[PDB]
């Protein structure tokens, strides 16, 4: 009956361009229980009216988590033209969304640190002539089109990955470039929160 946040507290978290997503329906949550397990640094939210995020019922609660350094904390705002908001992670502009940046504490050992931070600095699709470039901008609450061709971790800074598409899909190529940002001493991650609404069920209320 209680929403299970356990997949976040185990193993290694993914990168920003291949984030892991957890959807919560028909359960009760305790956001203070979660944020107490991480040193919370910076965070932001947008939109209310019901109004809350830890004191309201919704039809669903979406939570994306990924390893992200606080060095590029400014690249997460929607008003930024950085590759993160352009090719990696864009959250919903219409629905009420939140965005939390925290660090994995030293007393939280179940989460093992990845080798380094990784993100997509450019994801574009080239046509049959191999000259026309089409930037594949990421949509809100979607993955990059180049996720199918990029490793779960960028191996070296300045790497290029390309794969020829099938003639049924249109032919051409899909090319993406990777960038690496060296790891910190404590794992820094970013959490993306979005809430939906429906007429049928509202079984996503806070635990009281």
């Amino acid at each position, epitope marked *: 009956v209680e929403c299970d946040f356990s*997949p976040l507290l185990s193993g290694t978290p993914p990168q920003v361009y291949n984030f892991k997503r957890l959807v919560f329906t028909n359960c009760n949550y305790n956001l203070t229980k979660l944020l107490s397990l991480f040193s919370v640094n910076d965070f932001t939210c947008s939109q209310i009216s019901p109004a809350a995020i830890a004191s309201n019922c919704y039809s669903s609660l979406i939570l994306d988590y990924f390893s992200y350094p606080l060095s590029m904390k400014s690249d997460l705002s929607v008003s930024s033209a950085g590759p993160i908001s352009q090719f990696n992670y864009k959250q919903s502009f219409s629905n009420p969304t939140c965005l939390i940046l925290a660090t994995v504490p030293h007393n939280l050992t179940t989460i093992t640190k990845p080798l380094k931070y990784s993100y997509i600095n450019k994801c574009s699709r080239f046509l049959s002539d191999d000259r026309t470039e089409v930037p594949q901008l990421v949509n809100a609450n979607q993955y990059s089109p180049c996720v199918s061709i990029v490793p*779960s971790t960028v*191996w070296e800074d300045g790497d290029y990955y390309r794969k020829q598409l099938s003639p049924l899909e249109g032919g051409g190529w899909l090319v993406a470039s990777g960038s690496t940002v060296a790891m910190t001493e404590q794992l820094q991650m970013g959490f993306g929160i979005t809430v939906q609404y429906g007429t049928d069920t509202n079984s996503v209320c806070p635990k009281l």
Partner: antibody
Amino acid sequence: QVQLQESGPGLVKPSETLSLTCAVSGDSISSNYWSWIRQPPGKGLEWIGRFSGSGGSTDFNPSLKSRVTISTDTSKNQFSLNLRSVTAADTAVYYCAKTYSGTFDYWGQGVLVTVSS
Amino acid sequence: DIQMTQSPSSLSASVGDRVTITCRASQDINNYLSWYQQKPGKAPKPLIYYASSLETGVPSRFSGSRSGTDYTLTISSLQLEDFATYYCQQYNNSPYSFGQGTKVEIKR
């Protein structure tokens, strides 16, 4: 159009060291990534290690990392595999292949290496 | 490491049947899974990359899917060309583990 061809002795004496060279035709090794994969006769696949002719540093399997090394050649458009202290369990069909994220787009005709005195 | 449990190890089916081959990972691989077809005495042939994306020039009978942490390769209509050994591979983290393989053999 990118092709591959393995070139090996086929028989390696037990105590000594085996060298396996992979020839890539129709593409440059100074881009993308490449790797080696072996398969013992009658069992599954074992991934040796990935490397890069573009970067290019490597990443190997810890089960064979202490006995595996790799050389790279740009002009000859090839790369070799060096496995020392081979045992009777190292009898396998070795494949070299291309990659971009860990999968394998193109494989080469595997070469057999048998170790026995 | 992350290790793969592919099942069934072998199955007997005939032409026209629908056969599903599953593959479970010890940890979450985040859809970074690939399928291969291996004919006897030949190199593995890539069929599916990123769990569900079909390779170029591969028939539409082959499809990829994911439910929970189980990855399934389903051949809608089996045919004579498809009787071989199939493998699943993960490339989420090193070292890259391989499936034991599933041998699809014609049934008498």
